[PDB]
């Protein structure tokens, strides 16, 4: 969950 | 009180990852506008685009709410992919106009009922729009739609959850907190609030063909679905 992971920490 | 904070910090976060049908400016597409197609390519092109782009948003929404980035990286993911097309679902119906049958998406697109059906929702139309005139006559502020919102996510009974208990418990506070604004708001109406709480179970059954309709998109669509969409309903 590459992208969710980079969005829920940002 | 405290009530009163936690209510504003969500009227905030969904207020702030919202924009309203009032401040947005409508327009429309020609594409398939009046003939029911199985796909049209043009509209699931515009409709995927603006879902990646409302997915990023409802991520920033559930940041905002208390506790949510205290549970366990895991249980946000399992959270926010559970209640992914429960939200999005939500959030288009919040924009239906009765009189042209429409919905208004995020950046003013304005499709109607044929061109939803013809964007990707197919099978899904009918019940979609039957929730948006269900859900209209409620008359529901950004606090309200906020809040259901939460609760929708903030759900301790979803599958492969880490700590379900822990999730219970930050939802209770959710409950609370719209039980006691919405008989502040409609203090006439005391059906308000149990007839608000059945929508979840409306979207969640709406949500749970919506993942059917995923299955059988997948295979008209030309290529494959966005990364984005691919990781939250994959
Ligand atoms: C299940 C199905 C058909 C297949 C995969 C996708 C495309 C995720 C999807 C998305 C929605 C949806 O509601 N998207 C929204 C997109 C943008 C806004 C906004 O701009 O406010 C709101 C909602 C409904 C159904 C489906």
């Known amino acids: 969950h590459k992208i969710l992971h980079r969005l829920l920490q940002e | 009180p405290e009530v009163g904070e936690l209510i504003e910090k969500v009227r905030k976060a969904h207020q702030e990852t919202f924009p309203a049908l009032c401040q947005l400016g409508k327009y429309t597409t020609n594409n398939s506008s009046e003939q029911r197609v199985s796909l049209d390519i043009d509209l699931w092109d515009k409709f995927s685009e603006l879902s990646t782009k409302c997915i990023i948003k409802t991520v920033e929404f559930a940041k905002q709410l208390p506790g949510f980035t205290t549970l366990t990286i895991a249980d946000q993911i399992t959270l926010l992919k559970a209640a992914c097309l429960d939200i999005l679902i939500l959030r288009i119906c919040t924009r239906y106009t009765p009189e042209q049958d429409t919905m208004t998406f995020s950046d003013g697109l304005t499709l109607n009922r044929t061109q939803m059906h ?65 008989r502040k708001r409609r203090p006439s109406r005391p059906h308000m609030f149990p007839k608000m709480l059945m929508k979840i179970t409306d979207l969640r059954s709406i949500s749970a063909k919506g993942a059917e309709r995923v299955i059988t998109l997948k295979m008209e669509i030309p290529g494959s679905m966005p990364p984005l969409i691919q990781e939250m309903l994959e």
């Open chain 2, 118 to 182: 013809n964007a990707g929702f197919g099978p899904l139309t009918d019940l979609v729009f039957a929730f948006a005139n269900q859900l209209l006559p409620l008359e529901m502020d950004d606090a309200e739609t906020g809040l259901l919102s939460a609760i929708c996510l903030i759900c301790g009974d979803r599958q492969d959850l880490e700590q379900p208990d822990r999730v219970d418990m930050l939802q209770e506070p959710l409950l609370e907190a719209l039980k006691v604004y919405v």
